[PDB]
Amino acid sequence: TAELMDKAAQQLFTVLGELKGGAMKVGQALSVMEAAIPEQYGKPYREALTKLQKDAPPLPAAKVHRVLDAQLGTKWRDRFSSFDDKPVASASIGQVHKGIWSDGREVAVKIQYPGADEALRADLKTIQRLVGVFKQLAPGADIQGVVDELTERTEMELDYRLEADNQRAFAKAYRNDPHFAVPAIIASAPKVVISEWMEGIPMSVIIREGTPEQRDLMGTRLTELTFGAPARLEMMHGDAHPGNFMLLPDGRMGVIDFGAVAPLPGGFPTSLGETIRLARDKNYDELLPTMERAGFLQKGQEVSIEEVEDMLRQYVDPIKVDVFHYNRKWLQKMAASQMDNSVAQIKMARSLDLPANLAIPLRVIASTVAICCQLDAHVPVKVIATELVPGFAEE
Numbered sequence: 178t179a180e181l182m183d184k185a186a187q188q189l190f191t192v193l194g195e196l197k198g199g200a201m202k203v204g205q206a207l208s209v210m211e212a213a214i215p216e217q218y219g220k221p222y223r224e225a226l227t228k229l230q231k232d233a234p235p236l237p238a239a240k241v242h243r244v245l246d247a248q249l250g251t252k253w254r255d256r257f258s259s260f261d262d263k264p265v266a267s268a269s270i271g272q273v274h275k276g277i278w279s280d281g282r283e284v285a286v287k288i289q290y291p292g293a294d295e296a297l298r299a300d301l302k303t304i305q306r307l308v309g310v311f312k313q314l315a316p317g318a319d320i321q322g323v324v325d326e327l328t329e330r331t332e333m334e335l336d337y338r339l340e341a342d343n344q345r346a347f348a349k350a351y352r353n354d355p356h357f358a359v360p361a362i363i364a365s366a367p368k369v370v371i372s373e374w375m376e377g378i379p380m381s382v383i384i385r386e387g388t389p390e391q392r393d394l395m396g397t398r399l400t401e402l403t404f405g406a407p408a409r410l411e412m413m414h415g416d417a418h419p420g421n422f423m424l425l426p427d428g429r430m431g432v433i434d435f436g437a438v439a440p441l442p443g444g445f446p447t448s449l450g451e452t453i454r455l456a457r458d459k460n461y462d463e464l465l466p467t468m469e470r471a472g473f474l475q476k477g478q479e480v481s482i483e484e485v486e487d488m489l490r491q492y493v494d495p496i497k498v499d500v501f502h503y504n505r506k507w508l509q510k511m512a513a514s515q516m517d518n519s520v521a522q523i524k525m526a527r528s529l530d531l532p533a534n535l536a537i538p539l540r541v542i543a544s545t546v547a548i549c550c551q552l553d554a555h556v557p558v559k560v561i562a563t564e565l566v567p568g569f570a571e572e
């Protein structure tokens with residue numbers, strides 16, 4: 178009901194508002210939920226998130242210098258023609274400065290925030306408590322996946338060298354690509370990563386103020402990145418935030434943050450594309466056994482065709498048409514509770530028999546979809562899935 182909705186909204190904003198000091202990671206991680214919760218909460222929600230990242234104190238220049246000393250060595254300044262002490266932005270667990278390398282190249286220097294591990298912990302339990310709230314505000318959305326990602330990052334060490342290696346992997350896979358640009362890695366260390374500076378319009382800016390063409394283009398690029406990275410280098414860019422992306426003057430999307438890259442050995446399983454095609458064809462005779470074999474449906478659990486159609490609708494709708502209009506209203510409709518009790522709501526992303534190489538794709542797809550809806554992007558999902566998603570193309 179509307180009253181329970183009000184209750185949950187109150188609780189959410191209470192928790193967010195009580196957080197003073199640092200909750201940067203929470204504020205980022207919660208972005209995917211923004212276009213899913215009821216519109217009447219959209220404005221304060223955004224604001225809350227913004228504040229969580231505003232009230233996060235920047236690293237003083239002296240502290241930054243000490244990190245650079247510890248990570249790169251006493252003579253770190255010798256690596257630079259110049260270094261700008263005033264931070265230009267914040268990316269995940271890092272503060273970004275601009276500099277000029279000794280060879281003249283403009284560079285981005287990302288310095289990890291010192292207390293970051295413990296920060297990630299406190300923020301994880303923060304989100305954990307909010308799962309109930311979100312399940313009330315947007316039952317059709319997957320807050321559990323947000324918790325899952327955060328948990329998977331509290332899980333290992335925050336070694337920027339891994340991030341840098343993954344960035345190099347993408348830079349190699351997308352070298353001279355007509356649609357994507359990846360900044361070249363220049364140097365790395367557990368708490369520092371230095372790359373070539375990349376100039377463009379931040380996606381967050383496009384989400385707020387972009388022309389229809391800019392919005393459509395960025396959504397289309399993100400969709401191609403999501404469907405294509407597994408085929409091109411057996412990874413996914415991963416749980417994304419608009420801060421990860423920018424629009425370059427030459428029409429390419431720049432990808433500047435790789436902190437959430439997920440390995441996907443073998444790429445997309447064919448069962449994913451097959452499942453969506455069969456669902457669109459309403460070929461239930463083949464669909465249900467395909468899903469049970471793949472793990473989309475838990476084995477031994479009786480489900481109706483109507484329940485299956487409901488669970489697949491969010492994946493099928495965008496490829497029913499040549500160009501799908503991702504938008505907040507559609508997403509908010511997907512996330513909302515059921516009208517009545519006619520069909521039970523089963524989330525196949527949450528299936529108990531779902532293997533990791535299906536779980537990760539579903540999570541990253543949902544991230545991408547959320548961002549496309551925030552962008553209000555028109556995307557030719559159908560042709561992109563036909564080209565890139567195994568098993569989706571007609572046989």
